[PDB]
Amino acid sequence: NHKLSESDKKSKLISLYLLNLLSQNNTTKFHSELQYLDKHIKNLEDDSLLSYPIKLDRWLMEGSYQKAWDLLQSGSQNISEFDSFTDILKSAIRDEIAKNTELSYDFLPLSNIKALLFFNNEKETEKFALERNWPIVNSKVYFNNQSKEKADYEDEMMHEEDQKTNIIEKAMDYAISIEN
Amino acid sequence: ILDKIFYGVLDQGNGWLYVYETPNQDATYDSALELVGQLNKVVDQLFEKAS
Amino acid sequence: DDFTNELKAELDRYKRENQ
Amino acid sequence: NYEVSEKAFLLTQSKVSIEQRKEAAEFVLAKIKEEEMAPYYKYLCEEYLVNNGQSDLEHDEKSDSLNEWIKFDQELYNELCKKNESKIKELNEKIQKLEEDDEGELEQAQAWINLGEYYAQIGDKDNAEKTLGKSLSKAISTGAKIDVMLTIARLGFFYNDQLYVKEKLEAVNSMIEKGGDWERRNRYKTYYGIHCLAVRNFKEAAKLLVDSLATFTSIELTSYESIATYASVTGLFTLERTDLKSKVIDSPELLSLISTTAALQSISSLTISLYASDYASYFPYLLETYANVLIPCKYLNRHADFFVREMRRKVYAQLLESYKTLSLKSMASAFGVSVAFLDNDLGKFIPNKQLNCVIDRVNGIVETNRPDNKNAQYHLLVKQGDGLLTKLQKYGAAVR
Amino acid sequence: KTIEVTAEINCFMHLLVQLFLWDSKELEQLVEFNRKVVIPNLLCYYNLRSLNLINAKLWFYIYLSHETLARSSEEINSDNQNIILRSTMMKFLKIASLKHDNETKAMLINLILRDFLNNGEVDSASDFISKLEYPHTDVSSSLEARYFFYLSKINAIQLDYSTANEYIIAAIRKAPHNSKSLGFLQQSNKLHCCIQLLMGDIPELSFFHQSNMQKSLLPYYHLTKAVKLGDLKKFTSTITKYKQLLLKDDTYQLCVRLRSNVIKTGIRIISLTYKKISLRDICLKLNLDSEQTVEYMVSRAIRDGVIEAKINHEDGFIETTELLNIYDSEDPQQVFDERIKFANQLHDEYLVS
């Protein structure tokens, strides 16, 4: 049933799975585990430990990564158990911000990237730009990667190259055979 | 200009002028009027035959 | 409503006529 | 019957002058002596409450009013029986003798209609429609058809009911379609545009009102100045400036109508300022049109804010078509408004996709987005084209 | 023995009408008695004319009452009768030859999906979707709307409103029955509006005003003005007062997802049309909630597909775009293949007619 002594007893280990699941950038399985809990408004809503990933993901969906980053620092639960999933989830948050900084920032200097993503070193800031293929000039960082291509294999679908002229004529020949 | 006498539009910010050609439309959407009137009548007539 | 549009129109007239 | 409903409507809402309620009470006291207003006189406390609606000495006992003439007394109770005996008891005895003697055919039907009109003034609508239904079978030509339609037409103006009236007026008109002259057809045409104000049909109301004459006066059904405000306000909102120049602003009757009374303030103040594109004095005309026209009128008070809010959106469209760009400093200051007031009106209009415009913050330049050759084939052809295909799939996906 | 078993079931289905919402007998012995009258080879070998004679439509609303505050009353982990029911349910589909099975295949999945909606994990339900998809020709018009109702709800938890869009359209058009047009339709219309909550449109009340009672109109009207105007204070007070209605429909999750849409929808409501938007003008707009979140708020909304903008920290403004262009070469050709794809759904009418 639900009753042994303390029921779920430790609430921190249950929240470890919800915090570590977001490190893979999967938002579908995050809300699926919340439905698995028997009491949504009793154990999940009242206790701040089970409500920690909900309030953390709430700021992630609203778009604010600065308030979500403060929960992994000012919180006193990051000492022992949550220390393992702190830096791992923080690395996934910074990687998620990097996807936003491409489209939302046409040009940004080097000093701001350190402050926005909470970097402790300017040389380490440029190291992250090399793995993400970010062009670097004096006191500025541009993005030439806004254009996308490759993405596994695709043929005659999603903005083709040399078949554009044919597919337009092929779509006209498909309706003729349906009537015939 | 609003009376369809002179054709053009001005610029208040820079004090400039812009070019506006005389015809504003060809004949295209006039065929869509026959489509909207058909889908608002014949479609409603289909249920009268079924029911 | 009408109270919002009428109030902002009268308050601006007192300031505009004094300029 | 409309003279009382028009004056007593000012009793509902008066935000300025108290004398407006006492002046309108003089017309009510004069009409209740000649004809019994008891159905509407009792409807006064059943219409709008918490002003004069709590004062009655008979059914419900409370005293709160600015008008003490709407309460029953020993005089109106005796006059209610005197008007009930003469218009019903005395007349029905003479009609009963004509039924046994078999005098005429349409004369007995017309006598039942005139008798049926008296039940409407006594406050009994059961016998009013009962005597009217018996005379309906005797109606063939337009002689007895006008009187039958006249009784039902009173139900809309006198009782302020938009539901059971139009359904009966359409059935009588569609049974035998002749119309007589053009004025007898107005009873169906004028009430049509008036009913459109209850369900908010907007441009549908002015279809028959703009083509209607300005000299039409139905007296007990409607007044001269009342119908003048209906065609002027609704007709201006319907036809765009292209149709205003050849119809509204230049008309033989309309130019004669604006000079008759100053209570219009539509085809003069609003039309000239729109034609001359003067926005300095155009804004205070909307306040005078709202207070002195929309509020005192019956069916023009139902929309309220739906007039000024919609009319201000369309007047900007006339300015956007005459310029590619504009000046924010001139629109938010020189026209008589403020900066916060302009952002509040245009704040709700932009997300509704009601107009195409470019608003600037730092530069302060209001720019018009012009489709050029796009016109109606850009966003309308895809929305209306695929939107009707969704309605086509409704009955084809689920079959029956 | 097909006629002998069918003749006995004809008298059994008449009792099941009493067992459904009418006469519940006992809350203990009956659930054990209804199990022993089914298992012993009522479905047999699938000989001939076997369908609609099982429980099927009858037991949907039965077993849910015995599980809640009847046999269990939160005294155990799960009903042992339901544990055996899950064994018999999944055994019925395992022994199915996928030949004449149409309506009976989709009804049993409705239980395993509904269980995951209250207590359970919906992540494993995605694996059943690949098995659940079949061209069922025997499903009655009453169950065609329910079959499309669960498929649209699972995708809502999966954060996809595009796939669930096609299923919810055909759900409200079906089930003409009165009971399905009152309780089932009002619950389905709120889920149809829930798709608009994740999309960001939230249209006004026109057809839905007279189609349903005022019970569902009050929360949707308050959430319409809260998400459009971008006010989290009014949006928070709506969840508290209407919490009673949010829990029974499993819509309580809107405190996170829909709360994030309050900001995204308010972006298109306010006018960003001008290019360079100063940081102070953004802080003043959207009450004080937009003052704390400025650069991060716009950064995620651009990648999500709401708007397209550019942020400049040097002079402290944000360059925004309203997505307005003119058709020249590749612009009008984007919807060219889409309008052809829109007609592909209508190309199947040749085989239907």
Short mmCIF file of N, CA and C in Angstrom, two decimals, chain E residues 16-89:
data_model
loop_
_atom_site.label_atom_id
_atom_site.label_comp_id
_atom_site.label_asym_id
_atom_site.label_seq_id
_atom_site.Cartn_x
_atom_site.Cartn_y
_atom_site.Cartn_z
N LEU E 16 -25.42 -7.88 -16.70
CA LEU E 16 -24.37 -6.87 -16.72
C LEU E 16 -24.93 -5.46 -16.84
N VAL E 17 -26.12 -5.30 -17.41
CA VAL E 17 -26.77 -4.00 -17.43
C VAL E 17 -27.10 -3.56 -16.01
N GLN E 18 -27.54 -4.49 -15.17
CA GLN E 18 -27.80 -4.17 -13.77
C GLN E 18 -26.49 -3.92 -13.02
N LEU E 19 -25.46 -4.71 -13.31
CA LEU E 19 -24.15 -4.52 -12.69
C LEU E 19 -23.49 -3.21 -13.08
N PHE E 20 -23.99 -2.53 -14.11
CA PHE E 20 -23.42 -1.27 -14.58
C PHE E 20 -24.30 -0.12 -14.10
N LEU E 21 -23.80 0.62 -13.10
CA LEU E 21 -24.42 1.84 -12.59
C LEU E 21 -25.80 1.62 -11.96
N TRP E 22 -26.33 0.40 -12.04
CA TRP E 22 -27.68 0.14 -11.54
C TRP E 22 -27.66 -0.61 -10.22
N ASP E 23 -27.36 -1.91 -10.27
CA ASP E 23 -27.33 -2.76 -9.08
C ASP E 23 -25.93 -3.34 -8.94
N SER E 24 -25.22 -2.93 -7.90
CA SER E 24 -23.83 -3.31 -7.71
C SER E 24 -23.65 -4.55 -6.84
N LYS E 25 -24.74 -5.18 -6.40
CA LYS E 25 -24.66 -6.36 -5.54
C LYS E 25 -23.81 -6.08 -4.31
N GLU E 26 -22.72 -6.82 -4.16
CA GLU E 26 -21.75 -6.61 -3.10
C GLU E 26 -20.45 -6.08 -3.71
N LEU E 27 -19.74 -5.26 -2.94
CA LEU E 27 -18.48 -4.69 -3.41
C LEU E 27 -17.31 -5.64 -3.28
N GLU E 28 -17.53 -6.85 -2.75
CA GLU E 28 -16.47 -7.83 -2.57
C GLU E 28 -16.71 -9.09 -3.38
N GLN E 29 -17.80 -9.82 -3.11
CA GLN E 29 -18.03 -11.10 -3.77
C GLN E 29 -18.30 -10.95 -5.26
N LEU E 30 -18.85 -9.81 -5.69
CA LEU E 30 -19.24 -9.67 -7.09
C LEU E 30 -18.03 -9.61 -8.01
N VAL E 31 -17.00 -8.87 -7.63
CA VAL E 31 -15.83 -8.75 -8.49
C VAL E 31 -15.10 -10.08 -8.61
N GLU E 32 -15.19 -10.93 -7.58
CA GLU E 32 -14.65 -12.28 -7.68
C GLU E 32 -15.57 -13.21 -8.46
N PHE E 33 -16.88 -12.93 -8.44
CA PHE E 33 -17.83 -13.75 -9.18
C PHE E 33 -17.83 -13.43 -10.66
N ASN E 34 -17.62 -12.17 -11.03
CA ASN E 34 -17.59 -11.79 -12.44
C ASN E 34 -16.35 -12.30 -13.15
N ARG E 35 -15.30 -12.65 -12.41
CA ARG E 35 -14.08 -13.16 -13.04
C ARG E 35 -14.23 -14.63 -13.44
N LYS E 36 -14.87 -15.44 -12.59
CA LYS E 36 -15.00 -16.86 -12.85
C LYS E 36 -16.02 -17.19 -13.93
N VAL E 37 -16.87 -16.23 -14.32
CA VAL E 37 -17.85 -16.46 -15.37
C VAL E 37 -17.36 -16.02 -16.74
N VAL E 38 -16.11 -15.56 -16.84
CA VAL E 38 -15.54 -15.05 -18.09
C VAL E 38 -14.42 -15.96 -18.59
N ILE E 39 -13.37 -16.13 -17.79
CA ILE E 39 -12.17 -16.91 -18.12
C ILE E 39 -12.48 -18.27 -18.76
N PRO E 40 -13.41 -19.10 -18.22
CA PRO E 40 -13.56 -20.46 -18.77
C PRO E 40 -14.06 -20.51 -20.21
N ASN E 41 -13.23 -20.03 -21.14
CA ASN E 41 -13.40 -20.25 -22.57
C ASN E 41 -14.72 -19.68 -23.09
N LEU E 42 -15.00 -18.43 -22.73
CA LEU E 42 -16.09 -17.71 -23.38
C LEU E 42 -15.67 -17.16 -24.74
N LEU E 43 -14.42 -16.70 -24.86
CA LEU E 43 -13.89 -16.26 -26.14
C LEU E 43 -13.46 -17.42 -27.02
N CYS E 44 -13.25 -18.60 -26.43
CA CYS E 44 -12.96 -19.86 -27.11
C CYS E 44 -11.88 -19.75 -28.18
N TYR E 45 -12.10 -20.42 -29.31
CA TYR E 45 -11.10 -20.54 -30.37
C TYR E 45 -11.30 -19.52 -31.49
N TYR E 46 -12.24 -18.59 -31.35
CA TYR E 46 -12.65 -17.68 -32.42
C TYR E 46 -13.19 -18.47 -33.61
N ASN E 47 -14.34 -19.11 -33.37
CA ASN E 47 -14.91 -20.00 -34.38
C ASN E 47 -15.68 -19.22 -35.44
N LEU E 48 -16.86 -18.72 -35.09
CA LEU E 48 -17.67 -17.95 -36.02
C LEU E 48 -18.55 -16.98 -35.25
N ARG E 49 -18.80 -15.82 -35.86
CA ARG E 49 -19.72 -14.81 -35.33
C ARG E 49 -19.39 -14.46 -33.88
N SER E 50 -18.10 -14.30 -33.58
CA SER E 50 -17.64 -14.00 -32.23
C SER E 50 -17.16 -12.55 -32.19
N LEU E 51 -17.95 -11.69 -31.56
CA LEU E 51 -17.64 -10.29 -31.29
C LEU E 51 -18.85 -9.69 -30.58
N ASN E 52 -18.61 -8.60 -29.86
CA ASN E 52 -19.66 -7.83 -29.19
C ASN E 52 -20.37 -8.63 -28.10
N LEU E 53 -20.09 -9.93 -28.02
CA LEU E 53 -20.72 -10.80 -27.04
C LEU E 53 -19.95 -10.88 -25.73
N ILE E 54 -18.74 -10.33 -25.68
CA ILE E 54 -17.95 -10.27 -24.46
C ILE E 54 -18.42 -9.08 -23.64
N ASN E 55 -17.65 -8.71 -22.61
CA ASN E 55 -18.02 -7.58 -21.77
C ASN E 55 -17.86 -6.27 -22.53
N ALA E 56 -16.63 -5.93 -22.90
CA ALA E 56 -16.33 -4.86 -23.86
C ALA E 56 -16.91 -3.54 -23.36
N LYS E 57 -17.88 -2.94 -24.06
CA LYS E 57 -18.37 -1.60 -23.73
C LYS E 57 -18.87 -1.49 -22.29
N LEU E 58 -19.22 -2.61 -21.65
CA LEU E 58 -19.91 -2.55 -20.37
C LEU E 58 -18.97 -2.28 -19.20
N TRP E 59 -17.76 -2.84 -19.22
CA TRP E 59 -16.92 -2.87 -18.02
C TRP E 59 -16.01 -1.66 -17.88
N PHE E 60 -16.09 -0.67 -18.77
CA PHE E 60 -15.22 0.50 -18.67
C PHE E 60 -15.44 1.25 -17.36
N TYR E 61 -16.69 1.60 -17.06
CA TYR E 61 -17.00 2.38 -15.87
C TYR E 61 -17.31 1.52 -14.65
N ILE E 62 -17.19 0.20 -14.76
CA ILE E 62 -17.49 -0.67 -13.62
C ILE E 62 -16.29 -0.79 -12.69
N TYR E 63 -15.18 -1.34 -13.20
CA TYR E 63 -14.04 -1.66 -12.35
C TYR E 63 -13.39 -0.44 -11.73
N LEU E 64 -13.62 0.76 -12.29
CA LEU E 64 -13.01 1.95 -11.70
C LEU E 64 -13.66 2.32 -10.37
N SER E 65 -14.92 1.93 -10.17
CA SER E 65 -15.59 2.21 -8.90
C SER E 65 -15.16 1.24 -7.80
N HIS E 66 -14.86 -0.01 -8.16
CA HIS E 66 -14.43 -0.99 -7.16
C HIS E 66 -13.02 -0.71 -6.68
N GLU E 67 -12.19 -0.07 -7.51
CA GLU E 67 -10.81 0.21 -7.13
C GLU E 67 -10.71 1.40 -6.19
N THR E 68 -11.61 2.37 -6.30
CA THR E 68 -11.54 3.60 -5.53
C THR E 68 -12.53 3.53 -4.38
N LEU E 69 -12.00 3.43 -3.16
CA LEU E 69 -12.78 3.52 -1.92
C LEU E 69 -13.89 2.47 -1.84
N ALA E 70 -13.70 1.33 -2.50
CA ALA E 70 -14.68 0.25 -2.38
C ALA E 70 -14.03 -1.02 -1.86
N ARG E 71 -13.30 -1.74 -2.72
CA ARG E 71 -12.57 -2.91 -2.26
C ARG E 71 -11.24 -2.53 -1.63
N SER E 72 -10.52 -1.59 -2.24
CA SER E 72 -9.20 -1.21 -1.76
C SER E 72 -9.30 -0.19 -0.63
N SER E 73 -9.83 1.00 -0.93
CA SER E 73 -9.88 2.11 0.02
C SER E 73 -8.49 2.47 0.52
N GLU E 74 -7.50 2.38 -0.38
CA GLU E 74 -6.10 2.66 -0.08
C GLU E 74 -5.57 1.78 1.05
N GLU E 75 -6.12 0.57 1.19
CA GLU E 75 -5.60 -0.39 2.15
C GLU E 75 -4.58 -1.35 1.55
N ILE E 76 -4.43 -1.38 0.23
CA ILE E 76 -3.48 -2.24 -0.45
C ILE E 76 -2.85 -1.45 -1.60
N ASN E 77 -1.88 -2.08 -2.27
CA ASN E 77 -1.17 -1.41 -3.36
C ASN E 77 -2.00 -1.40 -4.64
N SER E 78 -2.58 -2.54 -5.01
CA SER E 78 -3.40 -2.63 -6.20
C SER E 78 -4.39 -3.77 -6.01
N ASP E 79 -5.53 -3.67 -6.71
CA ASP E 79 -6.55 -4.69 -6.62
C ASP E 79 -6.04 -5.99 -7.23
N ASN E 80 -6.13 -7.08 -6.46
CA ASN E 80 -5.72 -8.38 -6.98
C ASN E 80 -6.60 -8.82 -8.14
N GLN E 81 -7.86 -8.38 -8.16
CA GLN E 81 -8.72 -8.65 -9.30
C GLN E 81 -8.27 -7.87 -10.53
N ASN E 82 -7.78 -6.65 -10.33
CA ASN E 82 -7.25 -5.87 -11.44
C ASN E 82 -5.91 -6.41 -11.91
N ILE E 83 -5.11 -6.97 -11.00
CA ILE E 83 -3.85 -7.59 -11.40
C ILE E 83 -4.12 -8.79 -12.30
N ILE E 84 -5.10 -9.62 -11.93
CA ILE E 84 -5.51 -10.72 -12.79
C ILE E 84 -6.19 -10.18 -14.05
N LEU E 85 -6.92 -9.07 -13.93
CA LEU E 85 -7.53 -8.46 -15.10
C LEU E 85 -6.48 -8.01 -16.11
N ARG E 86 -5.39 -7.41 -15.63
CA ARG E 86 -4.30 -7.04 -16.53
C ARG E 86 -3.65 -8.27 -17.16
N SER E 87 -3.69 -9.41 -16.47
CA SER E 87 -3.17 -10.64 -17.05
C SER E 87 -4.10 -11.19 -18.12
N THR E 88 -5.41 -11.13 -17.87
CA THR E 88 -6.37 -11.60 -18.87
C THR E 88 -6.48 -10.62 -20.03
N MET E 89 -6.38 -9.32 -19.75
CA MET E 89 -6.45 -8.32 -20.80
C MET E 89 -5.31 -8.48 -21.80
#
